[PDB]
A paper describes a structure:
The protein [name], secreted by [name], interacts with the V-[name] to inhibit acidification of the phagolysosome in the early stages of infection. V-ATPases pump protons across a phospholipid membrane using energy from the hydrolysis of adenosine triphosphate (ATP) to adenosine diphosphate (ADP) and inorganic phosphate. Successful pathogens can subvert host defenses by secreting effectors that target V-ATPases to inhibit lysosomal acidification or lysosomal fusion with other cell compartments. This study reveals the structure of the V-[name]:[name] complex, an assembly formed from the interaction of host and pathogen proteins involved in the infection of phagocytic white blood cells by [name].
One [name] construct, consisting of residues 16–278 ([name]-N), yielded two crystal forms that diffracted X-rays to 2.3 to 2.4 Å resolution and the structure of [name]-N was determined from these crystals. The second crystal form of [name](16–278) contained two molecules in the asymmetric unit related by a non-crystallographic two-fold symmetry. In this crystal form [name]-N exists as a dimer, with the two molecules swapping their second and third α-helical bundles (red arrowheads and oval). This domain swapping is accomplished by a rotation of ~180° relative to the first α-helical bundle that occurs through conformational changes within the short linker connecting the first and second α-helical bundles (residues 117–125). The domain swapping retains the interface between the first and second α-helical bundles seen in the first crystal form and the domain-swapped monomer is similar to the monomer in the first crystal form. The flexibility between the first and second α-helical bundles is consistent with the flexibility in the linker between these bundles observed by X-ray crystallography.
Author numbering:
A (entry chain B), B (entry chain A): 16 to 273
The structure:
Amino acid sequence: EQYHSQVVGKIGYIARCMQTIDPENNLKKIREDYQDVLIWAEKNYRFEEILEASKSGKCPNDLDALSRRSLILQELLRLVSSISPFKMKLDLIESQYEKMKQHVNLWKSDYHVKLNQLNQLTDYLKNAAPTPKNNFLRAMTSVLQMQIAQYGITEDNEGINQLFKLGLHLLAMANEKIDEQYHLFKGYVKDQPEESPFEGILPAEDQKILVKTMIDYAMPKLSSKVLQDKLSALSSSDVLTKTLLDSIDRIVKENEKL
Amino acid sequence: EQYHSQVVGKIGYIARCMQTIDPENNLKKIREDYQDVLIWAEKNYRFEEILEASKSGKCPNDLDALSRRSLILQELLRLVSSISPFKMKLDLIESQYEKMKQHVNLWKSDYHVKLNQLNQLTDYLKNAAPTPKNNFLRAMTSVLQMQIAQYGITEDNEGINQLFKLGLHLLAMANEKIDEQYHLFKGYVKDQPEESPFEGILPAEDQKILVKTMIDYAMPKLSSKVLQDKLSALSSSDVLTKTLLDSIDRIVKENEKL
């Protein structure tokens, strides 16, 4: 979708740039650098097929890495195109490629990549339908935005870097993996320092939808009426907390013995 | 798009960024860094007044520098805009600005600036009207394209740096200062090693046009019809050579001796 379509676009664009840079297939060093990507554009796959390969992790699907590696070939294509009709010798092209490589890699790092990754999260949520994944993602992103407002992105912050890791992973995760989504979000809430991490950060209406979501997930998995009675009452809270989640986890433990 | 017109465009875009980042004029250090820009753009000047200031040097008119300085504020605006509705303390904003400034300054340097300047000349020459200025510029850019194909732009080459400097200077030169255009091109041809620096590079069709350009320039300056006929005798050459310009100069010297 919004993410894996850009992955396929970057894969097709890298191959287009490589072919125009090296129209006679002689820049073996550069093509070996990109063969992990180029193979998916040379194997007669359709757009839908590469899309499913990106969702299943069969092809390169790190959009930020693909974007950085596309910029390298784009820079080299600009040079090759701007000196037309004059050809450059093959080893000189590779010499230019190595310098552009380290130059672009430095630019595509530090605060800049974090800034791009935040945009990936907000753009993905721009018109996202209210799903558990999208509710988890919008809650995590709002915490991320609040922490960046307090700490910035030019220095390293472990809590922010964890939100980027888990958030982007949830973003690229398949929409049908309900268990993996619930596991990721419950993992983040437990593995973060604050007790009520969403207080003052999300509207009160959204905080209740989060509580109702976690309740409706474990509700059909109670192998006893008595265990499913108290869990239904835990919806009396309107803020997702670590105590509320541990309360749900304890009910699954008492039901696991039965 | 004319050079100085692009200068005004970036001057305006910098002011709109600053107004969105700091609407109440509290980031004193950032506005101090951009004071040479904002003193023109934060007032109600007409476009033509800023344009005349750029063409006369009264306001910053380095298009690559202005592009670099604009990217810093573009990145800083992205951060402030991407964390909304959460806001950042003013000290943190200026702290993020300093690190973004150093990061962008690394990106907007080295081969990348030269690539932008080469792309700037080739963009301008795309379907450009065959005027003396554009013919002079296309002749120098073609020599620049050839030398780059031979040496690249990732390593420093002094001959290439002079073609950029002279090429961009002629690119920004007013289309009406025709005697200044001729003098620049005449000076490049004389201050370069090759006797005929355009053969093997520029097409023979354009070399003949380049010769006829130098003849149509010095013909009105001829007062006596005897010298006017001596200049047309030089038109039998299809190669612009150092000797052809020395001959046209000697014919122009004896005309002033009357």
